[PDB]
């Protein structure tokens, strides 16, 4: 018969136990059974977003028919899955596909109504096998569907339904729409208990029930891409894969060390100055110590919640994992790591440190971002530098951040260059700048520098972003910002902070510049802000430390060229003299260093005068800075 | 905010007893009143009631529609244009699930083109999208949040009853909006700023969900009554609503508490009591 | 058969020593192996802006399979590279693309789960044999993907992921996204040390290691 060639039997698969158990879905299986037993239009379609279990509802219907938990009208049905590609495949000649489809209809007539059919991806059917001599498979099943002689169960995605079936109103109305809503977190945990049994049996590991409730809860929180239970089942399954891989050869930490020692081994082999033999010896000793510990504990065998957390922290990038000791000792010394590039400015380093510490310790508000910030303070004191030190702390790279300069947004149009264009208009197909950048990388420091230069109501986009961490781009899809750090840097109290920083505490300074911002921003917007910091103007000792930072990076710039420089502290006191004024901050120091060092020094390098290898001493002249060769 | 909960409550109780007018949506509301007094929270508490989720609602943030050409983001792309086969954002998201709650968040930020679109929505329950077909809005509660009477309600809510305040802020709305769009409204409700008692109870709710976060983490907290009084007195000013409460709790509790959790200092299992020092709030272990 | 014609055996090419050595990419191949050994949805996809070495990750996995550094679950797997150009290549008659492709599905699922399938340019697979109202490669592979019987390592550019695969959200949920990071200056130096050996064997010259560290530094700094 044709049903042997072109259908694959589900109830034979359910009877031999080749289908995963189906848990919950009482309402939808009951409505599928109500709709399948009609007189005209026996046809349900299962409609819901991809991942919510529509094929699983048909497989639960097949298992309930095999177990006989259905009404008496269904005891003994066969549920046969129709594979439309297997119909289309060998139909080279004209009228071959229609012969196949008509043979299937004759055999389904001869079954005396005992066969439930099943066409997953029903949207495959509309326009299947059309040609010049088209009967299209939507125009041949249309009589057999209209008269109720065929018990087809489709299962199509909601967007695929709108695109492919509502383009054909006759075949749109042949089907009854059974909606399959996304299961919530609790229903997902029940589904994961049955599939816990099946995945434990496959991967030979043991999924602990806290890992299940972690997988459903965490993947409901930290993934907006996919839908339940599929994202939670994926966390469970990939976690069990990781545990079984650790069980197989050796854990991942010895894997890291083994790859690194073979890497640096053949890399030092390629170098045959180094600063490599030291690194290789340290990693070989670390490999020996952790292998000694692995022989001392002879390990992981179960999926706990820590494995779910590490799998989700490697899906996305959000640091959900438990803190290891290197990372935790790094993170308790947060402010020491930030004062290597931002000297002075303690209040902001305290604020930023505390926002990241609330993030990592898991006390952060899950409906808002990690922390919004408004770095006020005069020009040249460290606002943009703290954001670059944030990205260099957190992300190991200076320019690894979403930097949206708010000095291009001097008109109201240029909101559209961070939501994207609406439907119909030009840049529809590319989405926003900000929204695509977050939707790639959901854990990122979002900086909005020079924020007072923008149009006053460009910050309504930020009403949404700061309050709820969701911004809706042009095409429709909302992007989740709830794991980002939003930072806007301004200078709205420049002359006020330059004037009244003396004889005032931090609190009244914050209050007074906050009144200034109250005359600038809206009361909606300066309520969204987690913490407005106030920077302070830089003093002489601050500028001395900044001079030491800039001279260290100048030595870094001149070691690549092949030169050494030692300086005397008298010249550094001169740069502390010629690089001080309160009104312009720390850049007078930078251009004083630029002029009084790099112009005569590059003059003398390009003079054919300064031989490399000899230490360039920057002693003092009468007033200038000499560069000598000894 | 007793008046608004009465208004929304009566809208759903009019719908379930049959007495709704079936030529209109169920309730077309406009939430006025200053910042941080629970406009978006009444919308979230509705969707949590009616649908068992916080974001199970068609949340349209109206401050992304500040131009004249972003009406097409919700209606759809017109014939012969780029995103034609996907419709709009509002009409599809209703045409799937016709009994939903539509939050038109921060309504005054947009341009008045969207207000013409919502004239059709709020009066007759249909909004013909771009592909040329109606969409049934006779079953959705359309809710709009704004703060057009911010200075007026923050300054003059005292010594005035609710009706005179409603008339005064409705006059301010009449200056902002066309008479058409405020004629279609089922019920404009007016909020009021929060006193000490309201911020005290909101402080207890935010501390309950803080306890719930740390109970998920594995810790417990008992709090002193004096500690909760310092949280309620440090976070009280009438201008910013109930948000200085949230970030004051956030600072004074969650920064030193997470400081001590990350420090390897606070052992699990023990009740972390939050009692006060002279002015700070310290987390102790006994 | 069908796998002789419409696939290209990487492990034959790696075992003949015809591919480039692959250096680094440790977390990416480890998560590719963690995704390929699953029960359902065995399908990773390497995402990252073009140039970062995604085909190089899959060829590094093939060289680790041949030279024996993978776990025991992958010792002996073949890595076959599907050819989306050859499958449409002769099928102008109706059904013949689908005949070819379901022949590939038979001959792969008959291998008892031994052939790791690799499709560089997964976004070609999205709309491959989409005729005038017929079955493309997406709608055909789509039910053999979310049962784990097909081990399809995709590798698509991130921009074309958004253009072609997120347009069809079901094929989008079958593939587990493995991000591929743009490497640093230092990892680039290591990559250039192995490929220094190979390019010196090609051009009949020598390459001094200052030219490598200058090449990584200068190309990172000035070509944007
Ligand atoms: N109610 C459920 N009970 C048990 N397992 C379920 C349930 N819902 C989903 N699953 C599992 O979740 C995974 C995804 O569900 P699917 O039904 O395959 O998604 P879908 O319904 O096929 O949607 P598309 O568009 O076909 S991808 C499968 O492994 C199912 O076994
Ligand atoms: N605390 C600091 N430590 C080290 N360098 C600093 C510090 N503050 C400023 N600088 C230097 O200042 C330069 C730029 O300062 P920025 O903070 O970027 O100016 P700004 O704070 O952005 O103020 P405006 O209004 O944007 S000019 C950098 O090159 C730094 O070297
Ligand atoms: N009456 C209230 N009851 C409970 N929580 C409240 C209340 N008012 C404010 N909140 C809290 O404050 C936030 C809600 O403020 P919103 O209502 O969202 O502000 P808003 O009403 O939109 O005013 P604008 O227009 O944004 S300034 C949530 O975090 C709530 O926890
Ligand atoms: N880890 C690596 N080891 C060795 N060579 C590498 C490595 N990463 C990149 N390459 C080289 O980088 C070049 C590009 O690598 P590909 O894998 O082709 O990148 P690609 O991701 O395929 O780019 P597209 O987007 O697919 S065109 C080749 O010359 C590779 O040899």
Quickly list DSSP for A247-270: HHS--HHHHHHHHHHHHHHHHHHH
Please count the other Cβ atoms lying within 10 Å of the Cβ belonging to residue C56.
21
With contact defined as beta carbons under 8 Å apart, do C100 and C141 qualify? Answer: no
Contact A358 B258 (CB under 8 A): yes
Q: Whose CA is nearest to atom 28 of ligand 2?
A: A385
Q: Are strands A485-489 and A371-376 parallel, antiparallel or unpaired?
A: parallel
Q: DSSP letter for A93, please.
A: S
Cα torsion through A530, A536, A538, A540, rounded to 10: -130
* Cα(B82)–Cα(B77) distance, integer angstroms: 7
Closest by alpha carbon to A605, among A566, A564, A547, A568?
A564
- The whole-angstrom separation of Cα A358 and Cα A493 is 29
Q: Which residue has the tokens 């209606």?
A: B75
> What SS3 class is residue B161?
coil
The 3-class secondary structure across chain C, one letter per residue, is: CCCCCCEEEHHHHHHCCCCCCCCCCHHHHHHHHHHHCCCCCCCEEEECCCCCCHHHHHHHHHHHHHHCCCCCCCCCCEEEEECHHHHCCCCCCCCHHHHHHHHHHHHHHCCCCCEEEEEECHHHHHCCCCCCCCCCHHHHHHHHHCCCCCCCEEEECHHHHHHHHCCCHHHHHHCEEEECCCCCHHHHHHHHHHHHHHHHHHHCCCCCHHHHHHHHHHHHHHCC
Way the structure was solved: cryo-EM
Q: State both tokens at C51.
A: 């140039």
CA-based Rg of chain A, rounded to a whole angstrom?
34
Query: Cβ < 6 Å from ligand 1: which residues?
Result: A 20, 22-25, 50-56, 157, 191, 195, 229-230, 233; C 40, 146, 170, 173
CA distance A131 to C131: 10
CB contact (8 A) between residue C96 and residue A92 = yes
Cα B223 to chain center, whole Å? 29
Q: How far apart are CA C142 and CA C175, in angstroms?
A: 10
What tokens does A415 get?
A: 């909101």
CA distance C143 to B201: 53
d(CA A220, CA A366): 12
Taking alpha carbons only, the member of B208, B205, B209, B198 closest to residue B241 is B198
- Distance in angstroms (rounded) separating the CA atoms of residues A59 and A73: 18
> What is d(CA C120, CA C152) in angstroms, rounded to the nearest whole number?
10
Burial environment of residue A595 by CB neighbours within 10 A (0 to 12, 13 to 18, 19 or more) = exposed
| Deposited resolution, Å | 3.9
Per the listing, tokens 């049994």 go with A197
Find out whether A81 and A93 touch, Cβ atoms under 8 Å: no
- The residues, ordered by sequence, that sit 6+ positions from B16 with a Cβ below 8 Å of its Cβ are none
Pairwise CB contact (< 8 Å): C35 & A429: no
- A136, A202, A267 member nearest C190 (Cβ): A267
User: Best mutation site among C37, C90, C103 for testing chain A: the one with the most A CBs within 10 Å?
Assistant: C37
Give the nearest partner residue to A524 out of B35, B52, B261, using CB atoms: B35
Distance CA C216, CA C189 (A): 6
Closest residue in A to C208 (Cα–Cα): A271
- What distance in Å separates the CA atoms of residue A425 and residue B70, rounded to the nearest whole number? 10
Burial B170-197 (b: 16+ CB within 10 A, else e): bebbeeebeeebbebbbbbbbbbbbeee
- The set of long-range contacts for B208-217, using a CB threshold of 8 Å and a minimum separation of 24, is B210/A363, B210/B249, B210/B253, B210/B254, B213/A362, B213/A363, B214/A363, B214/B272, B217/A362, B217/A363
Any idea what DSSP says for residue A239? H
List residues bridging with B282 in a β-sheet: B275
Extract the tokens encoding B106: 């921060």
Q: Return d(Cα A434, Cα A420) in angstroms, integer.
A: 9
CA–CA gap between residue C59 and residue C54 (Å, rounded): 9
CB B25 within 8 A of CB B122: yes
Place of tokens 């023990």: B270
CATH architecture of A185-316: 3-Layer(aba) Sandwich (3.40)
Helices and strands per DSSP (H, E), number in chain B? 11, 8
Pairing of the two strands A7-9 and A78-82:
antiparallel
For residue A129, is it left (φ>0), alpha (ψ between -120 and 50) or beta?
left
Size of interface A-B (CB pairs under 8 A): 135
- Tell me the pairing of strands A78-82 and A115-120: parallel
Taking the CA of residue C24 as reference, the ligand 4 atom at the shortest distance is 1
How far, in Å, CA of A22 to CA of A52, rounded?
Answer: 12
Decide: A44 and A154 in contact? Cβ < 8 Å.
yes
The dihedrals phi and psi of B56, each to the nearest 5 degrees, come to -125, 80
Neighbouring CB atoms inside 10 A of A357's CB total: 23
Token pair 């018969």: residue: A1
Token pair 């409603």 in the structure block, residue: B166
- Interface probe with C: pick from A55, A241, A243, A247, most Cβ of C within 10 Å: A241
Here the tokens at position A360 are 């990592």
Is the CB of residue A53 less than 8 Å from the CB of residue A102? no
Helix A540-561 to helix A569-578 angle (10° resolution) is 120
Give the residue among A209, A220, A214, A293 at the shortest CA–CA distance from A251.
A293
Q: Assess contact for A366 and B217: CB atoms under 8 A.
A: no
Measure the CA angle with vertex B72, ends B67 and B76; round to 5°: 170
Residues with Cβ within 8 Å of A310's Cβ and at least 6 positions away in sequence, in order, are A242, A320, A321
Name residues whose C-beta falls within 8 Å of residue A354's C-beta, 6 or more positions apart in sequence: B251, B255, B258, B259
From C19, C47, C55, give the residue whose CB has the most ligand 4 atoms within 8 Å, as the site to mutate. C55
Q: CB within 8 A of B246, min separation 6: which ones?
A: A365, B206, B235
Ligand 4 atom nearest to C180, measured from its CA: 21
Strands A402-403 and A371-376: unpaired
The DSSP secondary structure of A166-214, one letter per residue, reads TTSHHHHHTSEEEE-PPP-HHHHHHHHHHHHHHHHHHHS-EE-HHHHHH
Give dist(CA C171, CA B130) in Å, integer: 28
Structure letter (DSSP) for residue A323:
P
Through-space distance between the first and last CA atoms of chain B, rounded to whole angstroms: 41
Instruction: Check if the beta carbon of residue A569 is closer than 8 Å to that of residue A362.
Output: no
Name the packing angle between helices A383-394 and A346-360 (round to 10°). 30
Spell A276-314 as b/e; 16+ CB within 10 A means b: eeeebeebeebbeebeeeeeeeeeeeebbbbbbbbbbbb
Q: How far is Cα B198 from Cα B196, in angstroms, rounded to an integer?
A: 6
d(CA A22, CA C26): 38
CA A534 centroid distance within chain: 31
Q: What is the DSSP letter of A360?
A: H
The C-alpha atoms of residue B123 and residue B137 are separated, in whole angstroms, by 10
Contact A527 B73 (CB under 8 A): no
Q: Which long-range contacts (CB under 8 A, 24 or more apart) does A614-619 make?
A: A614/A564, A615/A564, A615/A565, A615/A566, A616/A563, A616/A564, A616/A565, A616/A566, A617/A565, A617/A566, A617/A567, A617/A568, A618/A565, A618/A566, A618/A567, A618/A568, A618/A571, A619/A568, A619/A570, A619/A571
Q: Which of B130, B167, B124 is nearest to B142 (CA)?
A: B124
Ligand 2 in reach of A590 Cβ (< 6 A): yes
d(CA C95, CA A566): 78
Among candidates B127, B118, B125, which has minimal Cα distance to B60? B118
Residue A60: which residues within 8 A CB-CB, separation 6 or more?
A22, A25, A29
B281 DSSP 8-state letter? E
Q: How far is CA A389 from the centre of its chain?
A: 22
Q: Is A361 helix (H, G, I), strand (E, B) or coil?
A: coil
Atom of ligand 3 at shortest range from CA of B37 = 8
Query: What does the alpha-carbon distance between residue A210 and residue A215 come to, in Å, rounded to a whole number?
Result: 8
Which residue do the tokens 């949920």 mark? C173
Contact B20, B186 (CB under 8 A): no
Distance, CA of B144 to CA of B139 (rounded, Å):
16
The enclosing H or E element of A305 equals helix A305-315
Alpha carbon separation from B156 to B39, B173, B236, B285 (Å, rounded): 19, 16, 18, 47
Closest CA to B103 of B51, B154, B34: B51
Q: Enter the tokens of residue A43.
A: 């046809």
Centre of ligand 1 from the C-alpha of residue A189, in Å: 14
Residues A100, A452: Cα–Cα separation, whole Å:
70
In the DSSP assignment, the letter for residue B136 is B
Note the residue count of chain A. 630
* Ramachandran bin of A507, using left for φ above 0, alpha for ψ from -120 to 50, beta for the remaining angles: alpha
Whether the ω angle into residue B58 lies within 30 degrees of 0, i.e. cis, is: no
DSSP-derived 3-state class of residue A504: coil
Residue with token string 């998560």: C31
Give B210 to chain A, closest Cα distance, Å: 8
State the distance from the centre of ligand 4 to the C-alpha of C59, rounded, in angstroms: 10
Q: Can you list the alpha helix ranges (DSSP code H) found in chain B?
A: 2-16, 39-51, 90-96, 112-124, 150-156, 162-176, 179-183, 196-217, 225-234, 243-249, 255-262
Three-class HEC string of A389-446: HHHHHHCCCCCCCEECCCCCCCCHHHHHHHHCCCCCCHHHCCCCHHHHHHHHCCCCEE
DSSP-derived 3-state class of residue A562: coil
Instruction: Confirm if C154 and C145 have CB atoms less than 8 A apart.
Output: no
Kindly state the greatest CA–CA separation across chain C.
59
């Amino acid at each position: 018969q044709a049903l042997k060639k072109y259908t694959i039997d589900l109830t034979e698969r359910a009877e031999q136990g080749k289908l995963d158990p189906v848990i919950g879905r009482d309402e939808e299986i009951r409505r599928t059974i109500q709709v399948l037993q009609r007189r005209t239009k026996n046809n349900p379609v299962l409609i819901g977003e991809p991942g919510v279990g529509k094929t699983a509802i048909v497989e639960g219907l097949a298992q309930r028919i095999i177990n006989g938990e259905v009404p008496e009208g269904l005891k003994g049905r066969r549920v046969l899955a129709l594979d439309m590609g297997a119909l289309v495949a060998g139909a080279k000649y004209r009228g071959e596909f229609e012969e196949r489809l008509k043979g299937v209809l004759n055999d389904l007539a001869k079954q005396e109504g005992n066969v439930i059919l099943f066409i997953d991806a029903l949207h495959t059917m509309v326009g299947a096998g059309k040609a010049d001599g088209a009967m299209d498979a939507g125009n041949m099943l249309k009589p057999a569907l209209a008269r109720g002689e065929l018990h087809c169960v489709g299962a199509t995605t909601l967007d695929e339904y709108r695109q492919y079936i509502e383009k054909d109103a006759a075949l749109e109305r042949r089907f009854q729409k059974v909606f399959v809503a996304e299961p919530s977190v609790e229903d997902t945990i029940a589904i994961l208990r049955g599939l816990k049994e099946r995945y434990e049996l496959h991967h030979h590991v043991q999924i602990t029930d806290p890992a299940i409730v972690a997988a459903a809860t965490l993947s409901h929180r930290y993934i907006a891409d996919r839908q339940l239970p599929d994202k939670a089942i994926d966390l469970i399954d990939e976690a069990a894969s990781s545990i079984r891989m650790q069980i197989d050869s050796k854990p991942e930490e010895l894997d890291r060390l083994d790859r690194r020692i073979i890497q640096l081994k053949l890399e030092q082999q390629a170098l045959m100055l180094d600063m490599l033999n030291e690194e290789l010896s340290d990693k070989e000793r670390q490999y020996s110590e952790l292998e000694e510990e692995w022989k001392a504990e002879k390990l992981r065998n179960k999926v706990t919640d820590a494995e779910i957390a590490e799998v989700l922290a490697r899906w996305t990038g959000i640091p959900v994992s438990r803190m290891m000791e290197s990372e935790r000792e790094k993170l308790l010394r947060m402010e020491q790591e930030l004062h290597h590039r931002v000297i002075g400015q303690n209040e902001a380093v305290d604020a930023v440190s505390n926002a990241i510490r609330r993030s990592r310790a898991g006390l952060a508000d899950p409906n808002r971002p990690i922390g919004s910030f408004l770095f006020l303070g005069p020009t040249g004191v460290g606002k943009t530098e703290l954001c670059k030190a944030l990205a260099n702390f957190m992300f190991d790279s200076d320019e690894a951040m979403v930097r949206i300069d708010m000095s291009e947004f001097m008109e109201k149009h240029s909101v559209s260059r961070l939501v994207g264009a609406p439907p119909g208009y030009v840049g529809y197909e590319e989405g926003g700048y900000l929204t695509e950048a977050v939707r790639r990388r959901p854990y990122s420091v979002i900086l909005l520098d020079a924020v007072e230069k923008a149009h006053p109501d460009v910050f309504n986009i930020l009403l949404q972003v700061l309050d709820d961490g969701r911004l809706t781009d042009g095409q429709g899809r909302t992007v989740d910002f709830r794991n980002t750090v939003v930072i806007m840097t301004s200078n709205l109290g420049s002359d006020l902070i330059q004037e009244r920083f003396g004889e005032l505490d931090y609190a009244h300074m914050k209050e007074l510049v906050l009144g200034v911002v109250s005359h600038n921003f809206r009361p909606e917007f300066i309520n969204r802000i987690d913490e407005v910091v106030v920077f302070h103007p830089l003093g002489e000792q601050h500028i001395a430390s900044i001079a030491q930072i800039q001279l260290k990076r100048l030595y870094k710039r001149l070691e690549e060229r092949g030169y050494e420089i030692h300086i005397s502290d008298e010249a550094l006191k001169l740069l502390s003299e010629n690089g001080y004024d309160p009104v312009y901050g720390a850049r007078p120091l930078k251009r004083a260093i630029q002029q009084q060092i790099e112009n005569p020094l590059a003059q003398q390098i390009l003079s054919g005068e300064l031989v490399p290898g000899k230490v360039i001493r920057l002693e003092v002249n009468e007033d200038r800075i000499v560069a000598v060769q000894h």
